[PDB]
Design a protein around this ligand. Sequence first.
Ligand SMILES: CCCCCCCC/C=C/CCCCCCCC(=O)OC[C@H](O)CO
Ligand SMILES: CCCCCCCC/C=C\CCCCCCCC(=O)OC[C@H](O)CO
Ligand SMILES: CCCCCCCC/C=C\CCCCCCCC(=O)OC[C@H](O)CO
Ligand SMILES: CCCCCCCC/C=C\CCCCCCCC(=O)OC[C@H](O)CO
Ligand SMILES: CCCCCCCC/C=C\CCCCCCCC(=O)OC[C@H](O)CO
Ligand SMILES: CCCCCCCC/C=C\CCCCCCCC(=O)OC[C@H](O)CO
Ligand SMILES: CCCCCCCC/C=C\CCCCCCCC(=O)OC[C@H](O)CO
Ligand SMILES: CCCCCCCC/C=C\CCCCCCCC(=O)OC[C@H](O)CO
Ligand SMILES: CCCCCCCC/C=C\CCCCCCCC(=O)OC[C@H](O)CO
Length: 328
Amino acid sequence: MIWTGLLVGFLFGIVLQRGRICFNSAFRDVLLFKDNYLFKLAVFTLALEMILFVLLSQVGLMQMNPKPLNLVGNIIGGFVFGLGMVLAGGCASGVTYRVGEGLTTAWFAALFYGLGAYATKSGAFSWWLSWVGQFKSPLSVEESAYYVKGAGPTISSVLGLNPWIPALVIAALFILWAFGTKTTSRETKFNWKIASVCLALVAGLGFITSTLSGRKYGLGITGGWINLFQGFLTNSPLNWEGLEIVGIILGAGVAAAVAGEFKLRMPKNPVTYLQVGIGGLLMGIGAVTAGGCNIGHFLTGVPQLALSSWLASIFFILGNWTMAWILF
Ligand SMILES: CCCCCCCC/C=C/CCCCCCCC(=O)OC[C@H](O)CO
Ligand SMILES: CCCCCCCC/C=C\CCCCCCCC(=O)OC[C@H](O)CO
Ligand SMILES: CCCCCCCC/C=C\CCCCCCCC(=O)OC[C@H](O)CO
Ligand SMILES: CCCCCCCC/C=C\CCCCCCCC(=O)OC[C@H](O)CO
Ligand SMILES: CCCCCCCC/C=C\CCCCCCCC(=O)OC[C@H](O)CO
Ligand SMILES: CCCCCCCC/C=C\CCCCCCCC(=O)OC[C@H](O)CO
Ligand SMILES: CCCCCCCC/C=C\CCCCCCCC(=O)OC[C@H](O)CO
Ligand SMILES: CCCCCCCC/C=C\CCCCCCCC(=O)OC[C@H](O)CO
Ligand SMILES: CCCCCCCC/C=C\CCCCCCCC(=O)OC[C@H](O)CO
């Protein structure tokens, strides 16, 4: 059953590679290249996931599991994760999926992303994670058809509303925005409309099949890399998230090769390698501290209306802006 992560990861990697999904550049392309493609893709996918997650929970195929709120962890970890993603040339799992494209810089970043996240959870940096955990909010939701017992607070739980209500309100506003302003300049057939539906269906399949394997969450990155390193160095068995990372790399590699876009590549200057390795370390430190990455928090947690995920994605962007100015 854990092997469904390979299939979901495979399909996930295809969607990432064909759409060039890099959420962090959505706010940059709209102001600097007049390209709202990633922005439209982001808001539309979140809206569909808002509706899809609550619908699949209503029919008993899954339960939403919002990540716990930790003000210190979500903010500081999110900010640091934003810094490292710029140094690492990071992306919406681009450190992961561009490994299958043939970018040797991504090979470094992933290694240092995996090591740093491993070190922060259980190694030399775990003293910092242990200190951060003292600020965890005790706010929780109780068991229902919509939520796993003990999950983090959400927009509806705080407001005391059925999760259908803010999901339908915020998604309707998101859909109105994505279609209101008609998108500007891009000729890929894999347009933001078809890519949002595919990405939402993959995220729905991910949430359903992972729950059957015992991991009650949707798509993620950081936990899969830790599970892979743990299995290689401790002989621990792999789980759904570990085989998902394998599938992502495999899926992006297949898509890049079929489209003629695979090529082993090197940066123009070797110092980029040192730059993306510190980025991977910061990404590993920041993602574990914040309790999720651009996938576990932003893509998967925001549609669940999780307060921790919305707060962490705010500082993903602020950390991105900060390091983007430091570098450029
Ligand atoms: C760290 C754990 C990693 C686990 C996952 C690792 C396996 C996934 C790798 C897929 C790369 C696929 C490589 C595809 C190579 C394409 C070659 C090509 O396209 O060559 C064209 C050229 O014209 C010559 O004929
Ligand atoms: C991680 C990169 C994401 C890039 C795509 C963002 C899409 C925004 C929609 C939902 C996000 C929910 C989180 C709320 C915070 C995001 C909005 C924000 O930070 O806006 C700042 C400023 O207005 C900008 O010009
Ligand atoms: C950090 C983990 C990184 C894991 C590694 C990344 C995934 C695999 C990448 C490349 C392998 C493919 C080999 C590339 C060689 C070109 C493809 C090929 O097979 O070419 C044969 C040629 O056509 C005969 O004439
Ligand atoms: C033996 C190995 C020692 C490890 C050596 C490397 C330390 C990196 C670890 C965490 C830094 C993560 C980001 C730190 C953000 C600092 C801002 C802050 O709030 O500091 C709190 C203070 O550290 C609370 O005692
Ligand atoms: C955004 C525009 C397109 C919208 C597309 C989505 C369609 C939504 C239709 C009905 C949802 C609201 C009614 C669904 C039933 C909710 C009430 C309910 O059954 O709750 C039972 C109990 O609370 C737990 O088992
Ligand atoms: C009860 C049903 C519940 C829902 C179940 C859904 C099952 C279908 C899922 C996805 C199909 C849509 C996939 C669309 C793929 C389009 C690929 C594309 O864009 O093709 C470009 C073309 O090949 C360039 O030459
Ligand atoms: C509803 C609950 C789940 C039910 C089961 C739903 C299964 C949906 C899974 C995958 C569909 C999308 C798969 C990815 C298709 C990608 C096609 C593509 O990327 O084509 C680009 C084209 O080549 C131009 O560049
Ligand atoms: C089958 C192993 C083939 C050789 C490994 C390729 C090189 C790995 C080196 C770095 C990648 C770090 C993550 C690699 C993930 C490997 C997962 C693994 O080895 O799992 C063992 C399993 O847990 C036992 O029951
Ligand atoms: C929930 C209020 C109803 C209106 C909703 C409007 C649409 C979404 C706008 C903002 C939500 C984003 C939330 C981002 C995370 C904030 C959580 C937070 O800051 O909590 C501080 C608190 O003091 C810790 O004890």
